Write an enzyme that holds these catalytic residues in place. Sequence first.
Site, PDB file in Angstrom:
ATOM      1  N   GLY A 287      32.436 -22.813   0.016  1.00 34.93           N
ATOM      2  CA  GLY A 287      32.074 -23.789   0.059  1.00 34.93           C
ATOM      3  C   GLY A 287      31.037 -24.118   1.220  1.00 34.93           C
TER       4      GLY A 287
ATOM      5  N   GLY B  86      36.414 -13.264 -13.030  1.00 35.26           N
ATOM      6  CA  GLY B  86      36.935 -12.428 -13.328  1.00 35.26           C
ATOM      7  C   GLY B  86      37.648 -12.325 -12.086  1.00 35.26           C
TER       8      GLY B  86
ATOM      9  N   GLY C 114      24.756 -28.115   3.186  1.00 34.10           N
ATOM     10  CA  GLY C 114      24.558 -28.756   1.880  1.00 34.10           C
ATOM     11  C   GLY C 114      25.842 -28.624   0.497  1.00 34.10           C
TER      12      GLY C 114
ATOM     13  N   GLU D  27       0.992  -1.599   0.031  1.00 32.24           N
ATOM     14  CA  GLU D  27       0.012  -0.510  -0.499  1.00 32.24           C
ATOM     15  C   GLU D  27       0.992   1.099   0.029  1.00 32.24           C
ATOM     16  OE1 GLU D  27      -2.897  -0.135  -0.618  1.00 32.24           O
ATOM     17  OE2 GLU D  27      -2.917  -2.834  -0.456  1.00 32.24           O
TER      18      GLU D  27
ATOM     19  N   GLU E 111      30.806  -8.730  -2.809  1.00 28.98           N
ATOM     20  CA  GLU E 111      32.169  -9.337  -2.967  1.00 28.98           C
ATOM     21  C   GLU E 111      31.772 -10.852  -2.194  1.00 28.98           C
ATOM     22  OE1 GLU E 111      30.958  -6.409  -1.717  1.00 28.98           O
ATOM     23  OE2 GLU E 111      32.090  -5.233  -3.602  1.00 28.98           O
TER      24      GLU E 111
ATOM     25  N   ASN F   4      31.394 -12.944  -9.295  1.00 31.22           N
ATOM     26  CA  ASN F   4      31.379 -11.737 -10.316  1.00 31.22           C
ATOM     27  C   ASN F   4      32.352 -11.105 -10.795  1.00 31.22           C
ATOM     28  OD1 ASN F   4      32.162 -10.138  -8.549  1.00 31.22           O
ATOM     29  ND2 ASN F   4      29.802  -9.701  -7.873  1.00 31.22           N
TER      30      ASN F   4
ATOM     31  N   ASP G  86      38.710 -33.357  -4.136  1.00 36.78           N
ATOM     32  CA  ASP G  86      38.969 -32.265  -4.965  1.00 36.78           C
ATOM     33  C   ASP G  86      39.405 -32.306  -6.180  1.00 36.78           C
ATOM     34  OD1 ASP G  86      37.376 -30.315  -2.265  1.00 36.78           O
ATOM     35  OD2 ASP G  86      39.531 -30.033  -2.228  1.00 36.78           O
TER      36      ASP G  86
HETATM   37 CA    CA Z   1      36.489 -29.909   0.403  1.00 32.65          CA
HETATM   38 CA    CA Z   2      28.622 -26.302   1.119  1.00 30.35          CA
HETATM   39 CA    CA Z   3      38.881 -14.303 -10.735  1.00 32.41          CA
HETATM   40 CA    CA Z   4      32.313 -27.968   0.762  1.00 31.95          CA
HETATM   41 CA    CA Z   5      35.478 -12.832  -9.424  1.00 31.27          CA
HETATM   42 CA    CA Z   6      30.102  -4.211  -2.422  1.00 29.82          CA
HETATM   43 ZN    ZN Z   7      -2.639  -2.794  -4.899  1.00 32.29          ZN
END
Ligand code: CA
Ligand code: CA
Ligand code: CA
Ligand code: CA
Ligand code: CA
Ligand code: CA
Ligand code: ZN
EC number: 3.4.24.40
Length: 470
Positions: free
Chosen positions: A350, A361, A335, A176, A328, A342, A399
């Site tokens: 992770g 980049g 999970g 509203e 950043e 970016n 990994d």
């Molecule tokens: Ca790992």
């Molecule tokens: Ca994770």
């Molecule tokens: Ca990079």
């Molecule tokens: Ca991990």
């Molecule tokens: Ca990056």
């Molecule tokens: Ca920032």
């Molecule tokens: Zn409305």
Amino acid sequence: ATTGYDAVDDLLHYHERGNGIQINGKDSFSNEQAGLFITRENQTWNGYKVFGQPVKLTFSFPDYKFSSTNVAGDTGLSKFSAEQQQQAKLSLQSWADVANITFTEVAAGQKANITFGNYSQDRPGHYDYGTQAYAFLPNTIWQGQDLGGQTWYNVNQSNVKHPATEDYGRQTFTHEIGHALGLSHPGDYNAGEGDPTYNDVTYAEDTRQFSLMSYWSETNTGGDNGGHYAAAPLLDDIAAIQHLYGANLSTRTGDTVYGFNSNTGRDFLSTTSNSQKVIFAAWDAGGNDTFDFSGYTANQRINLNEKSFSDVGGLKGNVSIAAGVTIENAIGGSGNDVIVGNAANNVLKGGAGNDVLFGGGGADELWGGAGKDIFVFSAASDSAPGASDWIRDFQKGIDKIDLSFFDKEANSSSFIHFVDHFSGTAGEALLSYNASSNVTDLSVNIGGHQAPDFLVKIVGQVDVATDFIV
Ligand SMILES: [Ca+2]
Ligand SMILES: [Ca+2]
Ligand SMILES: [Ca+2]
Ligand SMILES: [Ca+2]
Ligand SMILES: [Ca+2]
Ligand SMILES: [Ca+2]
Ligand SMILES: [Zn+2]
Ligand SMILES: [Ca+2]
């Protein structure tokens, strides 16, 4: 081919829009277009068609008389309670955070630009259980009187009476107020006027996933808020309101943490438990910022690119970043997550689980954390010599480093290939292990230059026979 790159590619193309795209048999609008369509009435508190200028508004909670009748004919009026006032103020602040709007409260008796009031009857002695709320856009004139700014709510609805515990209530206040500031619904429809449904929208993105001015479920575009409702302006609402009053460049210009361990001081940008879900579109004007979703146990998908959507806390497409904002860092939960950075330098973590990390980049710092993690690269500029990414906790045999994009693009199994010494041939990859420093250098000559054009620094040993995806 089920690679880390595929997961990354999927997240990057999540909710693509505009440029002549069509979803649900409807035209797709970009964030910019949606913002303009939502403000199609061109009414602002600064004047008709006066855009981009800051505004100072007063608001109040008048002491309405039960037996009084308001301009729309409703009666059984009452003043907002303390819980309603408190939530209304949080909703006002959420709009002021994103656009150049200053709100100042005035006494109930003073004239105010924006007012809040409860109603309970559609006619004297007859309670209304069918309506929710309504408001008048700025410059709405009737009989020489300016109705703009008034907002009215049906206090017979529990969500309106207890907006602090029923999230639809808080969303209604935000919606509203949106009207009171000049926004319309994203399509031509209004309650108590025909039988509109999502099929009646003008553009595909007219859903609660993109705008809380919308009436339609986020599921229409593939989102899923788990039965919750966003409390603050969403992606397209931000574009709309900033079009009217300009972007607020002084909001959270310091280093901000969103999610867990948040320092935002905003209920809708913070969480303290796995059960408390967040739904927000982030607006941030500066600093080194982090999306901390470490306390969630669900599989998550976090994209730090502007205008993109993430899957956080068990929900789908519930978190997004406004146009022109740079976030950043990001921290995944326990999970199996997909985390996409970016062009800026990002710190990506992770956490537990089997994650997929993509720095993009800039000079990124990647931590897989526990589990079987995969670090994905798809361009020489992802880790240029001079601005190399660092993989800080690589575990050989557990990994993996995914360079599969390259041979796929070249459609050749021999483009990327390991050698013991450069020769100048494009595609050559070389591993240099320093047992004293515990650092492994991964150099690749993608362009076929005199020197390698890609260099990643890895903390730990790497086994060429088991640790790569090519
Ligand atoms: Ca790992
Ligand atoms: Ca994770
Ligand atoms: Ca990079
Ligand atoms: Ca991990
Ligand atoms: Ca990056
Ligand atoms: Ca920032
Ligand atoms: Zn409305
Ligand atoms: Ca910040």
